[PDB]
Design a protein around this ligand. Structure first.
Ligand code: CAC
Ligand code: CAC
Ligand code: ZN
Ligand code: ZN
Ligand code: ZN
Ligand code: ZN
Lengths: 327, 329
């Protein structure tokens, strides 16, 4: 069984699953302290329910919200929008790139206890258990980030829940992550190396898949175009087209690694952790939101000759194998 | 105006009595107490320790504390309200930002920060309806660009509401002078500002010049001393190795210079701490088993023994905080 914000579900219930998404990208305590930053909590919730319902109509049945503590994860919000949209949401533990001081000062043993409490006991006082561990590193792994990755590996080994990562693909950062995970005795089949569509280095990706890692091609609609004077939507966006990113999926399929591929949008319905109104920038670039994968990428791959059963394997079978707790 | 926001609602300033103007129930990080209460044993254990501690402070004469924990120090006003009611000690809550703002705060403009501080003063903290009665800000010795935004937003919020501003400084780097310059550039009266952690320095020229300008001087870490614990680097780094009597003698020094009306005294104590090394609360509790009662039980008799009149001490512990906290436009 897989833990969701509404309780446990069987593997067969998960269906078409988006493995790297967010309801809201924020900071610990921020949604509660300043909901008017998002208009209101109600407005944010209502936008998310419409968004999830659009995704559901395009075939999505489950999303994995990989928002951590320090991304301002509010599982009560996730539970509310999941119930109203009838879309399963898997919540995350772990730490992203903005840990507060009370986290930054902790040992690997302490972080392991924290990740374990969120998986085994529940998040806050909600009883909602995490079904995935999210971690992030920048280029060369910092000392604190290494502690996070080891704590993640140890919590995964104790519970069977998988680990999913944020990296800089342009720095081939998955290699350093993999080294740390393997030193801990973690199976690569429990690990998704994410934001992997941010590079054109196919050799780097194939090497990881060969070692048994899941490859997260999860920022496909963040491609953007026509924003090279933007001091925000050029370093956070790019200039590579989304079709170019999408073709990495075909490339990995053709090398015989369709079972290793996970695809997502890395979308959200509110964001406070960047510039004000960046949500408007994102929504203008990708009006499809979380429906971008099923509405654009899947038909694009089908028209490039990828068979239905392969597309179903990638969007249904692979996430189920990944999320089902396994040791 | 003649009333102050507390976590149980508004009180008249006459009700504040003996007030500790820089304290904490818990030193933490946003969201942390709710996500990981076992770090503190349990939320219940932490609340109980705070109530026992506040009750002892109350027995020693304390009637009000100002909890200067901000959003990013993990302020949980619901905890403050629970322990205030159970200890029957007034607690004034804070808005502002300390030294650990998350991205969602660090990326905000001075106008946005102003709106956040005003929300916490004028509307309430989170969904609790509890309103802040003070704005807490913190800087590095050299004020960073973001910290300067925070100080300007604090000044603007103070000017709109009358509620005071209190600061964290590196007194050894004379941090208060850069802060004062920013505050005054915004038109904020020095009488609305406490330059805190000023007992970290023995430079009386720095202290008296600020006091002469009408600033309140926070001599607010009196019990903090790692003397006898020099072999504990974290203790020394957090508390210094100046004695509590050395810190306390600055209270006398500013009185002797004629600035009794500018002095505010406190412990900068707390009942749990996650924003430093593990188990540090045990180190603090061993250094100062009196907790927040340290000021009334140890420092006040020390100053009376040094000859300071009872009326002067009452003015510092009662009148000065009342004048400071009372919203004044
Ligand atoms: C806050 As993000 C760019 O990881 O969705
Ligand atoms: C919470 As503190 C050590 O900055 O007074
Ligand atoms: Zn990411
Ligand atoms: Zn993400
Ligand atoms: Zn301080
Ligand atoms: Zn303090």
């Amino acid at each position: 069984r897989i833990n969701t914000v509404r309780g446990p579900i069987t593997i067969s219930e998960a269906g078409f699953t988006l493995t790297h998404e967010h309801i809201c990208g924020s900071s610990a305590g921020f949604l509660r302290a300043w909901p008017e930053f998002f208009g209101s909590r109600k407005a944010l919730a209502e936008k998310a329910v419409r968004g999830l319902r659009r995704a559901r109509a395009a075939g999505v049945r489950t999303i994995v919200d990989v928002s951590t503590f320090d991304l301002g994860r509010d599982v009560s919000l996730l539970a509310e929008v999941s119930r109203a949209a009838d879309v399963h949401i898997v919540a995350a533990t772990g730490l992203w790139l903005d840990p507060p001081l009370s986290m930054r000062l902790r040992s690997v043993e302490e972080l392991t206890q924290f990740f374990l409490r969120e998986i085994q006991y529940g998040i806050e006082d909600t009883g909602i258990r995490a079904g995935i561990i999210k971690v992030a590193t920048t280029g060369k792994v910092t000392p604190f980030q290494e502690l996070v990755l080891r704590a993640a590996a140890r919590a995964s080994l104790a519970t069977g829940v998988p680990v999913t990562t944020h990296t800089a693909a342009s720095q081939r950062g998955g290699e350093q992550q993999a080294a740390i995970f393997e030193s801990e005795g973690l199976s690569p089949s429990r690990v998704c190396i994410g934001h992997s569509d941010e590079t054109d280095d196919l050799s780097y990706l194939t090497a990881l898949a060969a070692r048994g890692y899941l490859i997260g091609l999860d920022r496909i609609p963040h491609s953007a175009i026509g924003l090279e004077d933007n001091a925000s939507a050029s370093a956070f966006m790019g200039i590579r087209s989304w079709q170019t990113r999408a073709l990495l999926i075909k490339a990995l399929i053709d090398q015989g690694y369709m079972k290793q591929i996970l695809v997502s949008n890395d979308w959200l319905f509110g964001i406070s952790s960047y510039v004000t109104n960046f949500m408007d920038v994102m929504d203008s670039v990708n009006p499809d939101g979380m429906a971008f994968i099923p509405l654009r990428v899947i038909p694009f791959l089908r028209e490039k000759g990828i068979p239905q059963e392969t597309l179903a394997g990638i969007t249904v079978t692979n996430p189920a194998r990944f999320l089902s707790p396994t040791l």
